[PDB]
Design an enzyme around this catalytic site. Structure first.
Site, PDB file in Angstrom:
ATOM      1  N   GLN A 290       0.826  -1.202   0.000  1.00  0.00           N
ATOM      2  CA  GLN A 290       0.000   0.000   0.000  1.00  0.00           C
ATOM      3  C   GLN A 290       0.862   1.254   0.000  1.00  0.00           C
ATOM      4  OE1 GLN A 290      -2.548   0.292   3.438  1.00  0.00           O
ATOM      5  NE2 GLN A 290      -3.457   2.227   2.756  1.00  0.00           N
TER       6      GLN A 290
ATOM      7  N   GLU B 138      -3.643  -7.060  -1.108  1.00  0.00           N
ATOM      8  CA  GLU B 138      -4.995  -6.676  -0.743  1.00  0.00           C
ATOM      9  C   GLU B 138      -5.544  -5.691  -1.765  1.00  0.00           C
ATOM     10  OE1 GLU B 138      -2.368  -6.174   1.381  1.00  0.00           O
ATOM     11  OE2 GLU B 138      -2.249  -4.041   1.877  1.00  0.00           O
TER      12      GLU B 138
ATOM     13  N   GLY C  54       3.592  -6.174   5.373  1.00  0.00           N
ATOM     14  CA  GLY C  54       3.577  -7.605   5.153  1.00  0.00           C
ATOM     15  C   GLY C  54       3.908  -7.992   3.729  1.00  0.00           C
ATOM     16  N   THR C  55       3.167  -7.441   2.769  1.00  0.00           N
ATOM     17  CA  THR C  55       3.469  -7.717   1.368  1.00  0.00           C
ATOM     18  C   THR C  55       4.605  -6.839   0.859  1.00  0.00           C
ATOM     19  OG1 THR C  55       2.525  -7.859  -0.849  1.00  0.00           O
ATOM     20  CG2 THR C  55       1.711  -6.119   0.589  1.00  0.00           C
TER      21      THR C  55
ATOM     22  N   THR D 219       4.303   2.057  14.093  1.00  0.00           N
ATOM     23  CA  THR D 219       2.880   1.905  13.704  1.00  0.00           C
ATOM     24  C   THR D 219       2.424   0.434  13.592  1.00  0.00           C
ATOM     25  OG1 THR D 219       1.135   2.700  12.183  1.00  0.00           O
ATOM     26  CG2 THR D 219       3.187   2.155  11.152  1.00  0.00           C
TER      27      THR D 219
ATOM     28  N   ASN E 215      10.297   7.335   8.036  1.00  0.00           N
ATOM     29  CA  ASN E 215       9.112   8.186   8.007  1.00  0.00           C
ATOM     30  C   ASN E 215       9.254   9.387   8.933  1.00  0.00           C
ATOM     31  OD1 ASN E 215       7.507   7.200   5.998  1.00  0.00           O
ATOM     32  ND2 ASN E 215       6.182   5.976   7.332  1.00  0.00           N
TER      33      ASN E 215
ATOM     34  N   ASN F  26       4.596  11.872   0.726  1.00  0.00           N
ATOM     35  CA  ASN F  26       4.798  11.243  -0.569  1.00  0.00           C
ATOM     36  C   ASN F  26       5.270  12.237  -1.626  1.00  0.00           C
ATOM     37  OD1 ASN F  26       2.336   8.504  -0.646  1.00  0.00           O
ATOM     38  ND2 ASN F  26       4.003   8.986   0.773  1.00  0.00           N
TER      39      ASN F  26
ATOM     40  N   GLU G 297      26.276   5.273 -13.224  1.00  0.00           N
ATOM     41  CA  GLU G 297      27.242   6.064 -12.467  1.00  0.00           C
ATOM     42  C   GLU G 297      27.046   5.927 -10.964  1.00  0.00           C
ATOM     43  OE1 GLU G 297      29.758   7.863 -13.675  1.00  0.00           O
ATOM     44  OE2 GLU G 297      29.251   7.767 -15.807  1.00  0.00           O
TER      45      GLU G 297
HETATM   46  N1  LIG Z   1       7.254   6.431   3.107  1.00  0.00           N
HETATM   47  C1  LIG Z   1       5.998   6.064   3.347  1.00  0.00           C
HETATM   48  N2  LIG Z   1       5.740   4.895   4.034  1.00  0.00           N
HETATM   49  C2  LIG Z   1       4.463   4.517   4.284  1.00  0.00           C
HETATM   50  C3  LIG Z   1       3.406   5.295   3.843  1.00  0.00           C
HETATM   51  N3  LIG Z   1       2.261   4.691   4.222  1.00  0.00           N
HETATM   52  C4  LIG Z   1       2.560   3.550   4.877  1.00  0.00           C
HETATM   53  N4  LIG Z   1       3.922   3.434   4.933  1.00  0.00           N
HETATM   54  C5  LIG Z   1       4.667   2.324   5.547  1.00  0.00           C
HETATM   55  O1  LIG Z   1       3.929   1.127   5.397  1.00  0.00           O
HETATM   56  C6  LIG Z   1       4.025   0.350   6.568  1.00  0.00           C
HETATM   57  C7  LIG Z   1       2.781  -0.506   6.770  1.00  0.00           C
HETATM   58  O2  LIG Z   1       2.541  -1.324   5.647  1.00  0.00           O
HETATM   59  P1  LIG Z   1       1.460  -0.861   4.554  1.00  0.00           P
HETATM   60  O3  LIG Z   1       2.115  -0.108   3.424  1.00  0.00           O
HETATM   61  O4  LIG Z   1       0.417   0.002   5.212  1.00  0.00           O
HETATM   62  O5  LIG Z   1       0.767  -2.219   4.047  1.00  0.00           O
HETATM   63  P2  LIG Z   1       1.446  -3.207   2.976  1.00  0.00           P
HETATM   64  O6  LIG Z   1       2.767  -2.685   2.477  1.00  0.00           O
HETATM   65  O7  LIG Z   1       0.481  -3.410   1.842  1.00  0.00           O
HETATM   66  O8  LIG Z   1       1.632  -4.603   3.744  1.00  0.00           O
HETATM   67  P3  LIG Z   1       0.487  -5.129   4.738  1.00  0.00           P
HETATM   68  O9  LIG Z   1       0.785  -4.603   6.119  1.00  0.00           O
HETATM   69  O10 LIG Z   1       0.474  -6.638   4.751  1.00  0.00           O
HETATM   70  O11 LIG Z   1      -0.846  -4.603   4.276  1.00  0.00           O
HETATM   71  C8  LIG Z   1       4.217   1.345   7.694  1.00  0.00           C
HETATM   72  O12 LIG Z   1       5.095   0.830   8.666  1.00  0.00           O
HETATM   73  C9  LIG Z   1       4.829   2.561   7.037  1.00  0.00           C
HETATM   74  O13 LIG Z   1       6.195   2.644   7.364  1.00  0.00           O
HETATM   75  C10 LIG Z   1       3.658   6.469   3.151  1.00  0.00           C
HETATM   76  O14 LIG Z   1       2.724   7.164   2.765  1.00  0.00           O
HETATM   77  N5  LIG Z   1       4.956   6.852   2.903  1.00  0.00           N
HETATM   78 MG   LIG Z   2       3.325  -5.356   2.901  1.00  0.00          MG
END
Ligand SMILES: Nc1nc2c(ncn2[C@@H]2O[C@H](COP(=O)(O)OP(=O)(O)OP(=O)(O)O)[C@@H](O)[C@H]2O)c(=O)[nH]1
Ligand SMILES: [Mg+2]
Ligand SMILES: Nc1nc2c(ncn2[C@@H]2O[C@H](COP(=O)(O)OP(=O)(O)OP(=O)(O)O)[C@@H](O)[C@H]2O)c(=O)[nH]1
Ligand SMILES: Nc1nc2c(ncn2[C@@H]2O[C@H](COP(=O)(O)OP(=O)(O)O)[C@@H](O)[C@H]2O)c(=O)[nH]1
Ligand SMILES: Nc1nc2c(ncn2[C@@H]2O[C@H](COP(=O)(O)OP(=O)(O)O)[C@@H](O)[C@H]2O)c(=O)[nH]1
Ligand SMILES: [Mg+2]
EC number: 3.6.5.-
Lengths: 37, 426, 428, 426, 428
Positions: E11, E62, E135-136, E170, E197, E219, E245
């Protein structure tokens, strides 16, 4: 566009630079050998 | 031929030397844009003495602007005849010497002295062989005295056989400006007495006294004092630029004024000098040309030569004139003032004829004379320097910028020995 | 090229600084937006379309005076983190300035000074304005000078700190705050220039006949003083006076740099229509003890050094005639080891009048700064009313219980007592 | 008659040779569309040295545009005078060398060098007889340092007796870009020292030094510094296109600068170079040309010749000029600066007169000098190289392309014996 | 001819792809339908009659974040099968995200990464944007990097991995997911760049002064980083820097490929026109330790390489002049085996400000990617957090019973400590 060449074929700079002045206020002065007004 | 090299140091030297190039461009018919006008042989038959042909047809001055702050360099190029000079003759500082001797001599004049000897050698070695160096600066301030006189030290080492002509403006007794003046004055004097071939003295008290009595202006500015020094400094070099019945040069002055090399300090006079109230009432002739010129009121030092004794002297007569009335009148001034002239020297006078008069006049004279009355302002510098030094006041700048303390004790002792050796000839 | 950084610590620094920069904006031609409808460089920077942003920081631990500058007229002239603010007031406490609040604001403060200094080489020095009686003006004002000496060592640091009066002080613990500020600025300040509020009140009452002015009218007169000090840095003149000889001409010994000031003419429009303004009499007014700037009588003080800053259409001839008159004058006595006593600086720009202010359009003026032995009495009255209250532990529990220990009062006491002995020894 | 083939590699080389083909087009009257202008017989009597007649009226350059990335060659073509070059003389790469000598020299410099050899054989064999080659490239990069130097290798084997004259710009050591510079610098020197007849060292902070001190340019772009070195490229080949009272050649430079085959590394100076705030002030003569040329300020290699000895030198003059001053000035600088001129060679330096000066100027001079001061430049590149190779830094981009460690130590040996060989002649 | 393929997982990767392609569409003139009203060839492919089509895959098991993109404004810009959706969430589980639930989506992702990279030869490289704490983002990101390494081994593998902060994490099982992910991030990822972050949280808080910023504003800053990254690849410049490079100038050992990032200036309109943002004033803020985008304090680390890329009307005169004062200041320090440490890239085209965002229209910008020994600290507190909670078998049953085995945690512990022993071995 890249920045243009600043040298002619005479091999000299193309544009001046205005020197850092001091806000010149003049002073009216002349004397000796006729010594004006 | 010969080549007078001019160096223009300090705030004070940059104004009095700029006005100098206003009147020499006047005498040689040079436009402020660098070209020539006037249509005369006598304006440019000897032009390499002060100017160089720069293959644009213009005559650039062989003079270098030299200061530790661009405030004065901004002024000298903004006004008239600032276009005459070369910007590469200008050398710029950025920090500025705040009227401190060690500030200009040891700390930050050391890194600009390498660049300014590069431009000296650029224009010195470009000719065959030059005639001398002409050093105008200020001993009252810092960038003129300390940063100025290490140049005097360095170019004497490279060119010891050449003449070493310095015009230095001194601290003035009555007016109180640049309150640490006796430190800058004394620390420059004892080092240039073993270093300079001959020195002439200018004081702003005497230039003010000239405007009091002989010029009778109401509001004299610095530009008016500049042209007083400038008219005299043109006259001392006129025979090297113009012909005459009796030719001379700066080392003619040196051999005819210096019996002993330790005593090389002069007084300057310049006649005629009136306003328009007496421009058409005074008979412009040889009596008052020589008689105004032997006057303390006309002297450009803050000294009365009646107190002392004229050891040697010289007069620089300019213009078409009768030559008996030049030299026999200097014989009569020696006979009348036999008490004012030294006893073991007969014919104290050097004379020369510079047959081209200055612009705007037909007869003039310039005085360069070695009098023992130039002891007296060394006395007042001695009294006020030891007033500041016996309890070590204003000293922590001169200690903390890398300069020792026994350098001051030798500074006072050397000039006290110079004072004492002027006594024995009076 | 040339640039000078102004630091204003405390709300006394804020109120002196807003009027100081509104004169500079009217002196160079800066609209309240920072645009010029080239001497701005020595006080105003550049960023494109005329945007001449200022080169000054504004420290205060409380926000109640800083953010109302942000609300007021001069929003977009000042860079918004040049106005630096905390949350809680130091509230007349040296310990509250140093060890509890100032440690968290000084890191962002030197962060802004470092960015605002490294923009271009040519930094002449720092102009400090503060209140020694206050809490953040003295406590945080100290700790800024501690962190400026450790990094910016060899740079000049002028000072203009508002000493309290023998009578008008509007506090009770300024005996503590002032003499702890001396232990700061004998060995960190290069040149200290003294100020006093009733010494500006009595000038406003007598020299302009203004019976009810305020703090802001004091701030115009001092703004004219600082603008006259930087007159030669920005504008051209016959005698250039930059910052490096405010110290080498006025400070004879490194522990002797506390000095006095005076301004003349301070004359309204209704008095300038009859009095002729000659250079001889404006400097005669600058020598009168009643015209003094910090309430320090110079009849029992003995002038070691002086500086005169003429601004306007001043010919150098009557500069030298007027200064010869005061050497003839006996009641202004000078030191036998400093026979010469004067540094003169002429600038051609006339003083800039503010419309709606107190002063008129005069064609010539003097800004005189004189180091004299008379500064012994302004610290001797500090001796008398410090020991009169320190002897019975009054107002001590606020300091000792808030980080600083007992004993620092006694060594700062011995510090200003050593300053008393230095001024007595040099004045023989 | 003869032809000099410009071979021009690296993104440094293609934009430093675009300015080279602008100045020799300007000196030879070439409209950028290709036609001639200016109707002068001397201006096109020698065209076959750099241009070939296109049987459509135009003069196509003998230039080999060379790079491994298709960007800088598109910018050169899109610019002015970029449509002069033959489109097939361009050779295109699609991957590029990442400041990497391994993929520059071995892997990605191999599949494209078979096409460069085809085009350089096509133009040279079509000529009657060659005179030399002009290799302009960079040593701080990937493609100029990598297969520009392998191009140097194989045309030296295939043409064993011709001239190979290379303008190579060394990496800037003081303000270093392209962090793996000493691997590409040191280890392309030891290959080039047995395959180059004549080498001239260019340094970027020296090019900034002449833009700051002598040109006082406020904002120097790469177009300015590429234009300043093209003064050297045209002044070194002036007699190849133009007559003279005393003639020369690149072969004259070869036989009169190296007493031994290894010392073919030279410094380059060009005079005059002044701003137009001081151009009307510049007296332009032979003595002023030579003394301003003989300064470390003016020389476009960042090595101080005051710390070394000019083992051999040379000075190509240009313009109508008197031929007693084309040698009495060097007798002046040899007698004065004898401390900087080695003793076991008498009369260390030659000269020649080209008759056409560069346009806008009436006289000029270029300088190619074998000075032993270059020992401080190779040893200064040395202390970065041996420090970054002691602890195995960035080496896996080198050893991973058909490569081992042995020729890195051989690079250290073959360069420090060049340092030590220059040690014995100072 | 020349093209670059971006890859986003999780995500976080999807919305970090939404920001960097809101920007790239806004600078290339790409409307949300792709119709122009040859520099676009890296990120957009010409399809039909003047349509430019994204070069990526969007990956998430997801659907909850990805199918709301395909119902959005950018839905007729993107190809439908470049956005690949799963059915169930990986749920912070390396065991599911790698082994169990992530195996039926790799066969579609590798089909599309083949169909996108086979249209032209000379592919410049792959970019990867993964969430380490997810997770993913950790599980699926690991396995598809493994499969693209066996398929295309000789191509560049960029990665901007979003790491968990020391205090902002988080979730609860970030010790397992991040340590398991860095076991394979070590071994087959050519370039790794940390995007913590909380560091970018603080940067928006003081520089852009937003004290309620959201994941949108986080972002946009990454979008500016990737825009000035490939500015030299897309447009011309005074000195080109290729993606090849990067590893040749920042990676001296294949194990050490973990570098930093910083973007300056990030000024806000209000604070914008108040500073001459000069090629120096902006490179000093780029090297400021608190301007870090991954909160790795470098004062206790030694710089081992640094790459700076300027973007705007930048003259290289003050590039070399300002980087010299970087080299001379002693608050920064380089390890002695890299006496030089600077690779410079210059792009002529200035960055483009997004409307309604939080930046301003700035003419010149710097992005700086530095390798340092100070990567050892982000793994050192990673050592503390993992052992403190692996000690008594917390959350272990979600991994053991869902695909992996007891002992993967021990070796992922071991090889990160091998990374620490390798980093301090550089650190002498
Ligand atoms: N740099 C950045 N990191 C983010 C942002 N949103 C979520 N994250 C990171 O994403 C982590 C959580 O995983 P998610 O991206 O929400 O979900 P996912 O990558 O699909 O994996 P799942 O948890 O299984 O759903 C958090 O610990 C954040 O560090 C964002 O807008 N910018
Ligand atoms: Mg993930
Ligand atoms: N001349 C002048 N003096 C002021 C001004 N404001 C305050 N002062 C002086 O400062 C003293 C009171 O201390 P403040 O300056 O208000 O307090 P501070 O230095 O900011 O430190 P804090 O008490 O923590 O706020 C008064 O006695 C005044 O003498 C002002 O605007 N002009
Ligand atoms: N002869 C002469 N003296 C001057 C002039 N201007 C100022 N002075 C004197 O020089 C002193 C100041 O010298 P200063 O400018 O500080 O010397 P600097 O250090 O070389 O700049 C003052 O006491 C003046 O009396 C001038 O134009 N001519
Ligand atoms: N004199 C000069 N130097 C250059 C020019 N372009 C790049 N350089 C220098 O060359 C180095 C980069 O090497 P580069 O030529 O770009 O790599 P290459 O093309 O693969 O050989 C940088 O340190 C630049 O300072 C140029 O036009 N002139
Ligand atoms: Mg307080």
């Amino acid at each position: 566009s890249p920045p243009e060449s600043s040298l002619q074929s005479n091999f000299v700079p193309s544009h001046e630079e205005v020197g850092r002045h001091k806000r010149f206020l003049v002073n009216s002065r002349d004397s000796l050998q006729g010594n004006m007004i | 031929m010969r080549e007078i090299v001019h160096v223009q140091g300090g705030q004070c030297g940059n104004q009095i030397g700029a006005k100098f190039w206003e009147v020499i461009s006047d005498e040689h018919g040079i436009d402020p844009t660098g070209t020539y006008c006037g249509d005369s042989d006598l304006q440019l038959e000897r032009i390499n003495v002060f100017y160089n042909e720069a293959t644009g047809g213009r005559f650039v001055p062989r003079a270098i602007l030299m200061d530790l702050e661009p405030g004065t360099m901004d002024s000298v190029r903004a006004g008239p005849f600032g276009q005459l000079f070369r910007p590469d003759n200008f050398v710029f500082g950025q920090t500025g010497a705040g009227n401190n001797w060690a500030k200009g001599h040891y700390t930050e004049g050391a890194e600009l002295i390498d660049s300014v000897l590069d431009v000296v050698r650029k224009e010195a070695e470009g000719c065959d062989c030059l005639q001398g160096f002409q050093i105008t600066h200020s001993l009252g301030g810092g960038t003129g005295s300390g940063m100025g006189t290490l140049l005097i030290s360095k170019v004497r080492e490279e060119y010891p056989d050449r003449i070493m002509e310095t015009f230095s403006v001194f601290p003035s007794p009555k007016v109180s400006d640049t309150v640490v003046e006796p430190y800058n004055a004394t620390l420059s004097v004892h080092q240039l007495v073993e270093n300079a071939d001959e020195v002439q003295v200018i004081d702003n008290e005497a230039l003010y006294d000239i405007c009091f009595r002989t010029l009778k202006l109401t509001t004299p500015t610095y530009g008016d004092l500049n042209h007083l020094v400038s008219a005299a400094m043109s006259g001392v070099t006129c025979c090297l630029r113009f012909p005459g019945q009796l030719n001379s040069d700066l080392r003619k002055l040196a051999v005819n004024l210096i019996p002993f090399p330790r005593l090389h300090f002069f007084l300057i006079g310049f006649a005629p000098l009136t306003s328009r109230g007496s421009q058409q009432y005074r008979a412009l002739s040889v009596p008052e040309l020589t008689q105004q010129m032997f006057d303390a009121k006309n002297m450009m030092c803050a000294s009365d030569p009646r107190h002392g004794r004229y050891l040697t002297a010289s007069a620089m007569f300019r213009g078409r004139m009768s030559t008996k009335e030049v030299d026999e009148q200097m014989l009569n001034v020696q006979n009348k003032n036999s008490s004012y002239f030294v006893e073991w020297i007969p014919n104290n006078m050097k004379s020369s004829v510079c047959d081209i008069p200055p612009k705007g006049l037909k007869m003039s004279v310039t005085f360069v004379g070695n009098s023992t009355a130039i002891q007296e302002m060394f006395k007042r510098v001695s009294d006020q320097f030891t007033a500041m030094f016996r309890r070590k006041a204003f000293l922590h700048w001169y200690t903390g910028e890398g300069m020792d303390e026994m350098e001051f004790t030798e500074a006072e002792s050397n000039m006290n020995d110079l004072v004492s050796e002027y006594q024995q000839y009076q | 090229m040339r640039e000078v950084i102004s630091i204003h610590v405390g709300q006394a620094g804020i109120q002196i600084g807003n009027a100081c920069w509104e004169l500079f904006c009217l002196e160079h031609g800066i609209q309240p937006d920072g645009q010029m409808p080239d001497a701005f460089n020595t006080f105003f920077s550049e960023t494109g379309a005329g945007k001449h942003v200022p080169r000054c920081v504004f420290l205060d631990l409380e926000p109640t005076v800083v953010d109302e500058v942000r609300t007021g007229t001069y929003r977009h002239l000042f860079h918004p983190e040049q106005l630096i603010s905390g949350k809680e007031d130091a509230a007349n406490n040296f310990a509250r300035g140093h060890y509890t609040i100032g440690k968290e604001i000084v890191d962002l403060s030197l962060d802004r000074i470092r960015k605002l200094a490294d923009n271009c080489t040519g930094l002449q020095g720092f102009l400090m304005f503060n209140a020694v009686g206050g809490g953040t003006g003295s406590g945080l004002g100290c700790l800024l000078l501690e962190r400026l000496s450790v990094d910016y060592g060899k740079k000049s640091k002028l000072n203009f700190c508002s000493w309290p009066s023998p009578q008008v002080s509007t506090a009770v613990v300024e005996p503590y705050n002032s003499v702890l500020s001396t232990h700061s600025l004998l060995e960190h300040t290069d040149v200290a220039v003294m100020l006093d509020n009733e010494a500006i009140y009595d000038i406003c009452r007598r020299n302009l006949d203004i019976e009810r002015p305020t703090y802001t009218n004091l701030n115009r007169l001092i703004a004219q003083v600082i603008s006259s000090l930087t007159a030669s840095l920005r504008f051209d003149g016959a005698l250039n006076v930059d910052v490096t000889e405010f110290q080498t001409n006025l400070v004879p010994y490194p522990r002797i740099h506390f000095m006095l000031s005076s301004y003349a003419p301070i004359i309204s429009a209704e008095k300038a229509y009859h009095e002729q303004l000659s250079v001889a009499e404006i400097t005669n007014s600058a020598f009168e003890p009643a015209s003094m700037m910090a309430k320090c009588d110079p009849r029992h003080g003995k002038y070691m050094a002086c500086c005169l800053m003429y601004r306007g259409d001043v010919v150098p001839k009557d500069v030298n005639a007027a200064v010869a008159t005061i050497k003839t004058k006996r009641t202004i006595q000078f030191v036998d080891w400093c026979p010469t006593g004067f540094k003169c600086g002429i600038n051609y720009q006339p003083p800039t009048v503010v419309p709606g202010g107190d002063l008129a359009k005069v064609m010539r003026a003097v800004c005189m700064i004189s180091n004299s032995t008379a500064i012994a009495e302004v610290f001797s009255r500090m001796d008398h009313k410090f020991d009169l209250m320190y002897a019975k532990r009054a107002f001590v529990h606020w300091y000792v219980g808030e980080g600083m220990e007992e004993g620092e009062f006694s060594e700062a006491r011995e510090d200003l007592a050593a300053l008393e002995k230095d001024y007595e020894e040099v004045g023989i």
